[PDB]
Design an enzyme around this catalytic site. Sequence first.
Site, PDB file in Angstrom:
ATOM      1  N   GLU A 267      55.115  33.953  31.880  1.00 22.78           N
ATOM      2  CA  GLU A 267      53.695  34.216  31.709  1.00 22.78           C
ATOM      3  C   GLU A 267      53.392  35.435  30.842  1.00 22.78           C
ATOM      4  OE1 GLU A 267      51.064  34.862  35.223  1.00 22.78           O
ATOM      5  OE2 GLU A 267      50.762  32.688  35.097  1.00 22.78           O
ATOM      6  N   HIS A 293      77.555  25.251  41.834  1.00 19.39           N
ATOM      7  CA  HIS A 293      77.620  23.847  42.222  1.00 19.39           C
ATOM      8  C   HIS A 293      76.356  23.103  41.788  1.00 19.39           C
ATOM      9  CE1 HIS A 293      80.856  25.006  45.148  1.00 19.39           C
ATOM     10  NE2 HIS A 293      80.143  26.119  45.184  1.00 19.39           N
ATOM     11  N   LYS A 406      42.078  24.885  34.265  1.00 17.84           N
ATOM     12  CA  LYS A 406      41.058  25.178  35.262  1.00 17.84           C
ATOM     13  C   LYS A 406      39.757  24.459  34.929  1.00 17.84           C
ATOM     14  CE  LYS A 406      42.946  29.768  36.246  1.00 17.84           C
ATOM     15  NZ  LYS A 406      42.707  31.236  36.142  1.00 17.84           N
TER      16      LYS A 406
END
Lengths: 415, 415
Positions: A267, A293, A406
Site C-alpha cells: 500500500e 513445505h 468504495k
Amino acid sequence: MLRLDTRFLPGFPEALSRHGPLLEEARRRLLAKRGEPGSMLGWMDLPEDTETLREVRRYREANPWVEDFVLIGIGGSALGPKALEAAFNESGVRFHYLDHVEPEPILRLLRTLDPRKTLVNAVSKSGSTAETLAGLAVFLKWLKAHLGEDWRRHLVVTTDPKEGPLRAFAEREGLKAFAIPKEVGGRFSALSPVGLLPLAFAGADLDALLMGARKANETALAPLEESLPLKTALLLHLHRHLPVHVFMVYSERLSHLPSWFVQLHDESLGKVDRQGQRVGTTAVPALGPKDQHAQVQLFREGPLDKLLALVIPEAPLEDVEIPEVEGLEAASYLFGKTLFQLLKAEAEATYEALAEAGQRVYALFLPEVSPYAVGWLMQHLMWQTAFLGELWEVNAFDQPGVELGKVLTRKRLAG
Amino acid sequence: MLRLDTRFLPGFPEALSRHGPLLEEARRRLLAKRGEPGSMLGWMDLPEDTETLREVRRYREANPWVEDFVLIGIGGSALGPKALEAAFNESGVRFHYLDHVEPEPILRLLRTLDPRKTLVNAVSKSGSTAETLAGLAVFLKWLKAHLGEDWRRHLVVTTDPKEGPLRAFAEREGLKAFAIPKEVGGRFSALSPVGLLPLAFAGADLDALLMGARKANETALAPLEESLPLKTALLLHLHRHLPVHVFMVYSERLSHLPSWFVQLHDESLGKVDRQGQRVGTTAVPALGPKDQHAQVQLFREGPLDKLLALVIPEAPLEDVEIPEVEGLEAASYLFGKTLFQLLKAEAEATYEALAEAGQRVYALFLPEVSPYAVGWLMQHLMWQTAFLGELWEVNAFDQPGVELGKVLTRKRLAG
C-alpha cells in the site's frame, strides 16, 4: 540488537558506500517534511508518547471483567493488532477480529459470546470504513438487546480525535475513546492505541514495545554505517528490478507479522511515481519452517526474480527438550535437542539453501521474540518503507487506488 | 456448479479456440500417465473412495469425548485440513495445528489442554518429516504422563499404508491409523483421511465434499467448452511469463484456502522444465474484502505484472441484516442491507476496479461456501495445476528443491 546479515550478498558493504549520498539525500528529503501539516509522518513520534500508554493501561485495569475482546476493524486497524496480540497475549483474554463482513462467522460470535464479558472495540481512522460501520451496527443491536442501557461500557472507540462519525458517536453516547493522531495513517498506526489498547488487554509489556520502537528511531537518524533502516532500504532499492520481495519470519508467535508487512510495503510503495510510471514490488508473506513445505520449492527451482528477507530469532523465551521415544528410532537424531534448536537449524539451513539456489537473500536476526525486538523490527520496517518512498519518488503515505472500489460498492448497494 | 467469468478478458474465447489442440494434448498426456505406478495421480481417485469416509465417520462416532483435536503435521499434512476445518467446523471441537516447532506456543498447549479431552493426530506421508516427529515426541511424553495406559486411544496416525517410521510406530503400539494412498502426494492429499479425519470431528459433510470433487473430475473430462479446469489452466498459461498470480478469496470461512493454493501452485510448478529452464509463477494469497485495505492499492497503481483470480460466493448460508443505529446516520446507506449483500457488492466492485486499472483478472464463482462447492473448487485447482504441469513440461508431482534444507538442518543439529 536487531542485526542485519548479508553473508550471501558480498558486494553490499561497497554498494553502501557507493550509494551513501543517495541515501543521505533520501533521508534528508523525508525529515524535511516533518512538522508540515498533512505529511503523515506522525508514526515517527508514537514511540515517544509514553503518556497515552499509561492512559490505555489505566482504562484496561479499570475493566478487569473483559474476557472477550472484539476488535471491529480492517486493514491498518486490524493487521497491526493481530500481529502483536498473537505474539504477546499473556492475559488469556480471547480476541476476535471483525476484519470482514461474511455473515456466518459473525453470527457464530453473537451466539457463542457472553455480552456481559465482551468488550467491543470499533477501530477506524476516518471512522467511516464501510466494513467497520456494518460490523459495529450488528454488534450494537446485539449489545443493546442483551445489556439494555448498560451497553455503553461495552463499546470503546479508537479513531481520529475530532473528525468522523465514530468520534461523533462516541461523544454523543459518552463512550470511552482513544485517538489515532491526525498525522498517523492507518497503515502506520500499529503503535498508536490501535495496537496499544488490545495489547493492554492482552497483558503485553507496552513499555518494552515502545522502547524497541524508540531504538529503531535512533538507527533511522544515525550515521549511515549504523542506520539499519537505510541499509535495508538500499537492499530493496538495489533489487527493485526483481518483481517479488519475500518476507519470511521464523516464528509461529509472529505468524501474523508477514501480513502486516505486506500491507505496509504494498500500500505504501505500489504507486505512480513523479515520472508517471507504475512502480512498486510485490511483497509475499512466508513463515518458517512451514513454508519450506509450500513456497521454498519455488524459491529453489523457480525463476530468479526474488529478493528474500528472513527474520530469524536467536533465542527462545522458554525452550522444550525433544524427549526420546521408545519404538521410534528413526527420530533419535532429534532426541536430546530442543525445539528452538530445531527451529534455528532449519532457519539457517533454508537461508543457505536459498542462497545456494542463486536467489538474493539476507536476514534480520532478532535476539528473541519479545515486545522490545518486535517493536524495533516494526518501526524499522516503517522507516525502511518511508525511505524507499523517497528513493522511488512516490507518495508512501496515501492510497489513491482504493477509492474506486468504495464508490462502485456504494453504487451496487444502492440500486 | 462452479462458474468461470472472463468478462474483462474479451479475447479469451478466441484464445481458447486457438489453443484448443494444445490443451487437448496436455490433457491426453496427463491421462496417459494414469495406471502407471508412481505417476502420483491418486488424487483423481480420492473422490470415488466411498469406503474410507465411512471408516472415518465410524471412528469419529466411537470417540465423542474429543473436545480438542491436535493435528501435528506440516505443509501438505496441514494446509488442506486448516482450509477445510476453518470453513466447515460445525461441532465446536477446538483444533490446534502443530505446523511449526517454536517452543512457547506448544508449551502453552501442553499447559492449557485437558489430556482427557485431547485427541492427537500425527500426519505425515513419508512419516519422517522432521517437524512432525519432533512435535509428536513432545506430545507422546505428555500423553503418557497424564493418561497412563489410556494414552494409545488419544493418538491416531495418518501416514503411508506401508512405508515410514510412523506406520511402523502405529503398528508396534497398536494405534488407530489411516492411510495416505501411495499415489497421493502431500499437497494433493486434502481429500484423503488427511482432511477427512479432522473434518469428521468438525462435524462436516464429508460425502458432500467428495461429491463436489467428483463434479470437478467430470469437468476435467468434459468437452473443451465445458472443461473449466482446462480453461483456467489456459489463463494461467497465457500469463506464464508474468511473475505473479494472485489468488483472492472473498470469504472469511475460507480464509485458509489461499495458503493451500499457494503450496499447490508453487511447489507443483516452481520447477526446472524438460529443457532445463527455471519456470513457475509466484502465487500470492489474498482475502476479500480485507485486502482491499492492503494489497489492492498495489494491484491498482503498481506494475501490470499479475494475473488475478477472484473467488466469489454468490449466496450466504445464513445472512444478517445490518440494523439501523440511532445516532450513526453516516451509516444509513448500509441500514436495511445484509452483510452478504455488502460482501458481494465489494467483491464485484473490486473485480471491476482491478480490471479498470488494466490488470488481467478473472473470477470463479461459487454458489455458496459449502463442502460441495469447495470440494469442487479444490479438485478443480488440482486439475488446473496438473494440466499446467504438462503445458509447462515439468514434473508437477515431486519437490527436488526441499531436500537441501533438510540435509543442512540435520548437519546443523549434529555438529
